Every structure is written in C-alpha cells, then in structure tokens.
Amino acid sequence: FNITETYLRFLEEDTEMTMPIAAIEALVTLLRIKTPETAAEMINTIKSSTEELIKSIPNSVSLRAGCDIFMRFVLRNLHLYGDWENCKQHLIENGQLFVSRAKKSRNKIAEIGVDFIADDDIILVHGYSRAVFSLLNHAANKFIRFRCVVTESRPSKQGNQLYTLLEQKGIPVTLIVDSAVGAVIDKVDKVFVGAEGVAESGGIINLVGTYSVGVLAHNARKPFYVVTESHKFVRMFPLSSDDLPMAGPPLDFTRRTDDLEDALRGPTIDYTAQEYITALITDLGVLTPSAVSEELIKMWYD
Amino acid sequence: FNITETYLRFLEEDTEMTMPIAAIEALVTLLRIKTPETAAEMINTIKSSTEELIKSIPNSVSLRAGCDIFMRFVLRNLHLYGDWENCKQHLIENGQLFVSRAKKSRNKIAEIGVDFIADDDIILVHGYSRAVFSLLNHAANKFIRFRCVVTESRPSKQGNQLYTLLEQKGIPVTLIVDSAVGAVIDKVDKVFVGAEGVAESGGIINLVGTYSVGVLAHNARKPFYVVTESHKFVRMFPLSSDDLPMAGPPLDFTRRTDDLEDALRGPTIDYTAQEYITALITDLGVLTPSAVSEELIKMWYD
Amino acid sequence: HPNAATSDVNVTIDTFVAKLKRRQVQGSYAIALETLQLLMRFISAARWNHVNDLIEQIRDLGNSLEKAHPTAFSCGNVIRRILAVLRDEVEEDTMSTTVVAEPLISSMFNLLQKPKTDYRQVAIQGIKDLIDEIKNIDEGIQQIAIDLIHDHEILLTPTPDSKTVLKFLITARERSNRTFTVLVTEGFPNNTKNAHEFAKKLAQHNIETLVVPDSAVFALMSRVGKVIIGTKAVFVNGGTISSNSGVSSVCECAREFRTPVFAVAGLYKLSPLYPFDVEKFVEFGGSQRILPRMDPRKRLDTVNQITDYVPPENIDIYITNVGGFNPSFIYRIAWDNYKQIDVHL
C-alpha cells in the first residue's frame, strides 16, 4: 500500500520528526494492513517494499538499516510462543511507540552529555545531524563556557545552513572552508562529527568529508567525537579505505569538453576507521569502544 | 612615474609574465630616469618606493622577494671597482635582460624537469602556478601517458578557471572537493603543488588549503612536490603552525549576527613544514633538501 | 536524602566520611574493604519489608558516598557490584512470583519491549565473594604475566606506587631462567620516596636496578623494550587514572617509539562511569612541598597534581585475575560485573 510516496511526503517537515523514524512509522502502518498473523503473506510483502525503497533510494543506507532493525524486532517479538493476538497488538503499537522513544532518548542524552564540556573549550561541529545540534543547544541552555566553529560543506550548501541555524541562537561563529580545516589544530579543543550510519567495527558513514578530518585529528592528537541516537545500525563492513553502495559517480574522468556540461563527478559519501574515534555519544547509557558490534551480535545471533 | 601604475597596467594579459619579473622591470624603469650614478639620491628612494608598494599591497607576497633580489643584484654589481658609468649601463641593461631570462628558465624547466609523469602517473594538482601549467602543456606536446585530478580551489572560483585552461589542451579531467581528498589517495600516484613563496625554514607559503594535503601525503607516504620559478625566496620565518605576515584576518571570531553577513573569512593562506617536501623543481638545477636556505645564506653572506 | 533516617541504626557513615575527607584512610584496597564493612553493617542491622524501596535507599546511600568523596572509585565500584548481585536475584524471584527467550546473556530489545524470599543470605554471600576477590588478584595475573618478559630485554617502570605492580615484577624476577634490566623513573613531587623504596626492594631481590631521573628518559629509549603502568582506577573506554605523577609523558614517549604499554590493576578498580572530564576526577596536590618561603611565593604560583590521566590510545593490554584484556574489550567485563541501571545513581 505504497511507501515511496510516504517517503517523499517528508522533505520540508523534519526538525521535529526524523526521516528514518518516519520511514519506520510508514513500515509499521504498511504491516498493520496485510495481517501480521500470516507470516507468508506479510514478510514477503515487507521484503518487496524494502526492495522497492532501495530501488527508489539515491544516496542513503540508513533507511535500510532501520528497516532491517524493525524486521529483527518483529522476529524477536514472537519468542513468547503463546497466543498470536497479543503479540500482533504489541507489534501494531510499536510504530508510534518508536516515534515516542526518540524524545526520551534525546532527554537521556541531554543530561549525561552535558557533563563533557570543560572550561574554555572551542568546539568544531561537522555534518547535519539533529542530535549534535540538540546537544549544542542544550549545552547553551546549561550555561557552559563554549565556542562553535562552522565548516563549509558542499553537497547542496549544508555548512551555510548550519551556520544560519547557529546564528538564530546567539553564539559567535566563524566559517572555515574544508581545505582550510587542516591549519586549525591548537585553538579547537574537541572535534565533533555527526553520523548517518554506524557499522560493525565502529566505522562511520556520513557526508562530503570525515575520513580526512579523522586523519587530521589523529595527527594532532585531538579527540574525535561521534554523536548519534539509536537507529543507525548496519551489518556492513567496507572492503577498501572508502567503499559504499552508490547511485552517483565513483571517480569518473569526464570526456573532452569545451562548453562545460559534466565535471562535478567524484566521491560524495566517506567512511572513517575505528582507530580515529576516541569517544562515542549514544542514549544507551554510556558506551564507546566496540559496543556496536556486541549490539549487532545480540540482534542477529548469526 | 610610479611602480603601482605599471603593475596595474598588466591585468588581462599575464600567463607568462612572471609578475615578479614585471615588478623588477618596473623597478628598473623607475631607476633609469633619476641618474643611478649617485647612491645617496637613489637607493634610499628605491627603498622608500618599495615600502610604499608594501603599504599599498592588497594580497601579494612575492613582490618583496623580487625587490630584495633586485637590491642584492645591485649590491653585487658595484664590487668590480672600475667606473660608475659602465656599471650603471650594465645595471640598466639587466632589467629587460632579466625579463628575457625568465622565458629561457621556463623553457629549461619544461624540457628537462618534466620526467616525473611518464608511466600513466595520476597527478593531484593544487595552487595555481604558470610553471606547472607550462610543464603540463609541454608534456602533452611531447606526448606521454598521463592523467589529471583537480582539487576544488575556492578564493573566488579559480578552480573553474583552472578547469577551463586544462580543457583548451585536450585531456580528461575530474573535480574533487577538498573534504573527500582523504578518501581518494589510492589511484592517484603523486601530489604536485604551485607555491606563492618559499620560506627561510624551507616550508611553503601557499593558498586556501595545502597543509592538510601535505599531512595526508605524509600519512599515505605518496610524495609531495612543489614546482616554482626560482625567485620566490623571501626573508620570512613562519615560527608556529598558524602564523604568517598576512593582509587578511588570521581566524577572526565574528560576533553573533542574524542576517548571515559575516561568514566567509576562512584562511586563504596556509603554511606547511620543511620535512614534507620530497622534490622542489627549479631552473637553477634540480635541488631540494636545504637548497633555498643555502641560497639565502649566499645572498646575505651570513 | 539526608542522614535523618540513619543515626542510631548506622553511625559509621560519619566516620567513613571523616576518613575520606582528611585522608586518614590510605590505599584503594583499604577504602574498598571499609565500604564492604559498611555494606555488611547496613545489611545486618536495618529493616526492609519492601525490595524496590530498599534498592532505592541503597542507591541514595551510594550517591551520598560519591558526593562525600569523588576520588574513591573502588568504594563506588564495590557498591555497584553489590547492586548488580542483588538485581539478578530480584529478577529471578520476580519470575517465580509471577508463576522468556534471549540470544545471548543480555539483550537490547528487552528494554524497548514491555516486561517473600531468602535474598538477604545471597546478598551477604555476595559481599563475602567480593572480599575474596579483593584478597587475591596477583595469583590470577601471574599465569599470564610471566610469559611476556624475555631474556636480555629491558623494562621501563613509571608509577611504583601500586602494591600489585611490584608483586607482579617480583614474581617475574623469581624465575632463574629469566633475566631482565630494570629502568625506574623517579617522579619528583609525589612519587620520589616510593620510587626509592621500590628501588631498594629490587636491590634486595638481587636484580640489576637502574635509578633514572625524570629528564633522562629520552637518552635510554633506544634500548627500552616494554612499558608497565602502576594505575589506580580503570574505566569504560580504556582510559585509566594512575597512582600519582610521571606517567603521561613516559606513555607518550612509548607511543612515539612504538614501545608496548602494559597495564596491571584488577576488576575491583574498574569503574562503569565514564571519565568525560580530566579536571573533574583528577585531584591536585600541595604547593608547600615544592618551594620554601611564603611572601615571595604569593607571586610564584606553583602548579602540582597528584593523580594522572592517560588516554586509551597509548595503552593496549589490561591483564587481570580473569585473563588478558584490551581497552576495546574491557567495557564488556564491566557490564558482566555492573548492571545497566546501576551506572547512574
């Protein structure tokens, strides 16, 4: 009963919702039509829907991660081996319940995460993730000595947007180009990066440039930070230094031109290794080193 | 008579006139009017003019280097203890002669120092220098397996200009953002760079982002190269990682604005350390390790 | 929660506080023992009727203790362990009272999905078990510890303040087939006397001892084989608090030279709380010990600290009584000893 349309429906919304959360909700809604009782009629349909979504996907792995998590949850659900109605009801409940959860997670974050701020520490923020922004705003709320540094990101002018968002807060800020980020090593005390997908080992999928930043941090011995909630978990491991399922160009040397038509071709999404990250920020208590892998193991058991 | 006016006179032409050579020519022209026989009336005035030029500078470094070189040359000239007329005449001759020399130097560079790219070595070029471009074009002329990778330069969209220049030569090119530069070091063999000036310590005075690139190169052990015409040796010492005599602001934290006005004030000039250089290509022989410093010593006799 | 409820039932809390504040109690082990004793006293004397309420009370007490002294991690840890022990039993009981499937020992989805007995004796037993664990750590290390050091290898020892590390060294030195040269860094404002004592002990043991000043670490680094830390407290991500002075720089040096960095402590020192700030947990020493006079010393503001914090990037090995572990793995060990809700009190 459609899912692509639902996905499309969320573009100018957000800020209050959460794309992957929305997707999950949509999935749940789809599920509560074709009966969760008959497993043959339902699971296959769900799979088909997921395939369709993948086909319609441009540059996103997080939705897939969400859907597989949902599937896993569903599978777990039927372990009670009792009546087939209560379980169904629970499943039905668990969609808006997921939406509700996000708020609670945020709340949890905003009380433990505020302990990290030290006296006169300058913070650089990279990537458009809602969680990081929330953390920042709720740190301002707490009233702690802090500074904000903006990086000039170029997918569809994201850095500028981030800067603008920061402005409507009242915090003094300065914009730095992604090429010029290397020179800033002593002034910025902590390097903060948001994530779009957390892998097996603890590797991060995000945006236009993260790996380089990580490398720089390693070189300067400055702490590297990953800020996320709890829905972006993929059972994946990259083969090379940077490899992802992409709809865009993986390094394309364009043919001989004069009038300029196609030139903007290359890497858009980047992967960073486990060694670079020193601290991980999540709502599930406090966990850092290799907890994601453990979580995955718990989930899949395979 | 003015030097500033002369400098202004060249705008749309360039692309072979080595700006410093033009400056030297202008200086010579200024000199050969008010009798170069007297040292009291002349050298002081020249110095004053140079000071004025420095004061008037918008965003240029090499002028000073040129002027000091000229001064040194002048000093060298009057060591023959012969006569005032002939020496003066020789000095006068040596302005246009110097300009003439530059072309020969360029030719020497383009015929001898082009052997680095031969067996389909993929080049990562950043920082616009005429010499590097000449080397490229004259390599195409010679016919050799070669491939180009372009990193996006953003002072006032110079990357686009570079791309256009490349186009009028016939060769497939691709654009890479200096954020995803850490992701792509695998297929690209060697890194080549055009510099604004070479420091007393050995390091390179360049553009919007080079230090990070250097760091990346160091990490990857893929060699870092600098190709410049041998007259960019200024008496300047960048003692710390984030210090240079710059006309622009060095990381200015702007106040809390609302209309998004003050943002684009990111570091447009960056410095890298002495150890990063593997080979420095100059017309005065293939010399790198501590050659610039030696030259400086020879000049100042100290 | 104030001390209005506990006045005639339990009095020793005040004494414990006093011990903490003026530093009458010394050595983390002793603190842990004291904590255990306190817990025992609480258990034997007080009344409960309800279980959840009791748990809450315990949590409150723990919080109060933390508020009284933050640098006493062992105290906290022991309490947490006890809580964990209680919790499992409580969970078991609930299942019988009411009258479940799990892929592993603990599940993540169980938090999302909606979920009188003789537990006192079990609780009592837990304390005893903890005490036993505290008693012997070195016996569970030496079977792994005396396998790493080889003939004609040179050791470098920062922090000789810890009692376990010395013992570990001694056990290695016992073996007739094994021979090694020992370089000892002093640590001026906090570790000097202790270092001297350690050196003396080494001499007594009949081993080649080299007393090295804090400046002469760089010259001998071409010969250095291994690095051992005398740490006091272990944490979640891998980072450790060391037993006072001269650890960080040495570790950095080791990292630079790619020298292996070992750590010996124990799981009772291991904490389920994160060290988010260095400034919050690390306590500073005394200015009086460094330089005499007072009136010119108003101008001369001297900086000196007790404890030292080392990042998890430098340290690679954490051998305990159970076995050899990593900073990327030790979190799980903590979880196996302290439960999920017991982290925040």
Author numbering:
A (entry chain B), B (entry chain A): 4 to 305
C (entry chain C): 10 to 108, 113 to 128, 147 to 376
Sentences from the paper on this structure:
The map obtained using a linear mode dataset only did not yield a high overall resolution (5.7 Å). To further account for the different conformations of eIF2 in the complex, we also carried out focused EM data classifications using combined dataset without applying any internal symmetry and we obtained another four density maps (maps A to D in Supplementary Fig. 1), however, at lower overall resolution. To separate the different conformations adopted by eIF2 γ and β, we have applied two masked classifications. After the first masked classification, we obtained three maps A-C with conformations of eIF2γ tilted towards the PLD domains of eIF2Bγ subunit and distinct extended conformations of eIF2β. The tilted conformation of eIF2γ is stabilised by the contacts of eIF2β with the PLD domains of eIF2B γ and ε subunits and the contact of eIF2γ domain III (eIF2γ-D3) with the eIF2Bγ PLD domain (corresponding to residues 97–101 and 136–139 in eIF2Bγ PLD). In all three maps, the density for eIF2β allowed modelling of the zinc-binding and central domains in the conformation similar to the one in the TC, but with the zinc-binding domain only partially covering the nucleotide-binding pocket and extended central domain approaching the binding interface between the eIF2B γ and ε PLD domains. In two of these maps (B and D), we also observed in proximity to eIF2γ additional unknown low-resolution densities that could not be attributed to any region of eIF2 (extra density in map D). The extra density we found in map B would be in a similar location with respect to eIF2γ as eIF2B ε-cat HEAT domain in the structures obtained in57,58, suggesting the possibility of nucleotide exchange on the opposite side of eIF2B hetero-decamer in yeast.
